[PDB]
Design a protein around this ligand. Structure first.
Ligand SMILES: *CC(=O)Nc1nc2c(S(=O)(=O)NCCc3ccccc3)cccc2s1
Ligand SMILES: *CC(=O)Nc1nc2c(S(=O)(=O)NCCc3ccccc3)cccc2s1
Lengths: 304, 304
């Protein structure tokens, strides 16, 4: 037993990390097959970021201006193209370490692991969630751009995120692997405020089930509620509305523990109204929302 | 910016994980060079665990009884020996994926990453600390035994932990890679209670520095304290005593932020006496103690 914020093993992604330099800007690239994916702002100087015209900036760049280095060996760039906010650098060598992969665009509330990289080198791995306001709360310093988010199903890596920027409030914005930003964010050094960061209700309930499975049960009460009654409370506390789809997804957890979803909603309702009263749940003093129902099942069953 | 509970990239360790079976027991092994390291309780049946005589149990085992599988290929066992609570299975093939490595015995308060594995397959990676009572709070289900803890310095993996057991209270005990248990724990299904789980004071202060560096400053106050005055408060709240060595280790963090160590101790003192008052620090509602001063410097500087 025991329940931890766990990231996927990062090895399959570590073998894809490369360094991309264009002029004086160095960031990370993702090498899959004979293509290197990286944020298009690799072609910008810090001055360009205020109001870049990426199409015009890219005209002044040729294949030889993109320096791609994998470890200490140089990749030969034979083509380049811009797809939305990412550059695709065609190289003459297929990455021999390319794992089975897919590009997926995740929904808010879904979790993924991030392999933070600097100069093409991995520094660490952590788990986060795509917030309902389409930001992520990561750990990204200068040079981390191009670091990627992913999930793994047995041998298939599903890439879902590429890091592009830090908003003035310290939260992070980025794209899927087709270069489309999550949310309304743009790759420009401009006023971009995030919307309300609401709590992922279905994730909190999943984590409450994980807590019961691992022995933390003090929060279980003698009450029940309805979806509409629960949602009145959820609205008041800036929690996402719970739908029947969310209830359905919690079904396997409800079955394992014998606690009906609406009874767990009544425990969550009381926790929202009364607080933790100085107590903890799974080593946390707040309600954790970055474990999906699938993460809880996966961790609680031992899927490798 | 941003500050996350980050694990080391696990790729170098993933290439060392193997499955070891002896009779009807299957757990994880660590393949480095031509040796496979695994918990000696692989030779036990669940009945044996009540009172095992490992030397007597090992007499009934030959090289051919240890089945070592790396992926889907079988390793040939040409020798076996017991070192403390670990078995060393000499195989005829050096692991071609062996990284640069060391075996280190860590001190309480030190952190490390764990690559949770089942049947020789990695399932996830997370960061934890060796508690002052020599337990770890991990996430280990049946089959996770033999999963390892490690730190990475550029290309060198320092293995520090091998998982062996779960105490009746849900906390975890294990050995270094020489097979010596951390703490007084034994590889026997017996009454083994853990001592006081005190808070790692030097780690909490390091994390308070990380919070200031990343913008969370509400807890900074107009006060200072002394080591003896602080330690009176630390004793009352089951925090480890802070020594001048701990102050010295926080020096680079004190210098970066301009906040003297004893002033940060006075902030911690007030936080202990008054609580968070419904507020959070780096997304936590409790004082986090599983980031060492070295982890804070490493994450805040971008070491790969
Ligand atoms: C994702 C990534 O690599 N971002 C980068 N940002 C910069 C910048 S910046 O946008 O001006 N932000 C600098 C923030 C900072 C860091 C350390 C001390 C003070 C301020 C400038 C240069 C390079 C990169 S890479
Ligand atoms: C570290 C590791 O692999 N531990 C294992 N423990 C067992 C046991 S046990 O010690 O009896 N614990 C079983 C706990 C449990 C799990 C699921 C449902 C109920 C109880 C038995 C068999 C195998 C392993 S591997």
């Amino acid at each position: 037993s025991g329940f931890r914020k766990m990231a996927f093993p990062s090895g399959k992604v570590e073998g894809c990390m490369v360094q991309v330099t264009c002029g004086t800007t160095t960031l990370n690239g993702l090498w899959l097959d004979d293509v290197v994916y990286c944020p298009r702002h690799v072609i910008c100087t810090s001055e360009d970021m205020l109001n870049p015209n990426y199409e015009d900036l890219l005209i002044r760049k040729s294949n030889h201006n993109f320096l791609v280095q994998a470890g200490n060996v140089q990749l030969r760039v034979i083509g380049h193209s811009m797809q939305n906010c990412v550059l695709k650098l065609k190289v003459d060598t297929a990455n021999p370490k390319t794992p089975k992969y897919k590009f997926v665009r995740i929904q808010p509330g879904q979790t993924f692991s991030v392999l933070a990289c600097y100069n093409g080198s991995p520094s660490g791995v952590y788990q986060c969630a795509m917030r309902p306001n389409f930001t992520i709360k990561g750990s990204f310093l200068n040079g981390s751009c191009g670091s990627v988010g992913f999930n793994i199903d047995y041998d298939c890596v599903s890439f879902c995120y590429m890091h592009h920027m830090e908003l003035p409030t310290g939260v992070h914005a980025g794209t899927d692997l087709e270069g489309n930003f999550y949310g309304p964010f743009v790759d420009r050094q401009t006023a971009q405020a995030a919307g309300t960061d609401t709590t992922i209700t279905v994730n909190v309930l999943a984590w409450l089930y994980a807590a019961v499975i691992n022995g933390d049960r003090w929060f279980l009460n003698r009450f029940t509620t309805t979806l509409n009654d629960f949602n009145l409370v959820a609205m008041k506390y800036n929690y996402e509305p719970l739908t029947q789809d969310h209830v359905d997804i919690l079904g396997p957890l409800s079955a394992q523990t014998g606690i009906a979803v609406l009874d767990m909603c009544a425990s969550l309702k009381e926790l929202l109204q009364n607080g933790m009263n100085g107590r903890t749940i799974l080593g946390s003093a707040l309600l954790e929302d970055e474990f999906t129902p699938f993460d809880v099942v996966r961790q609680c069953s031992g899927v490798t």
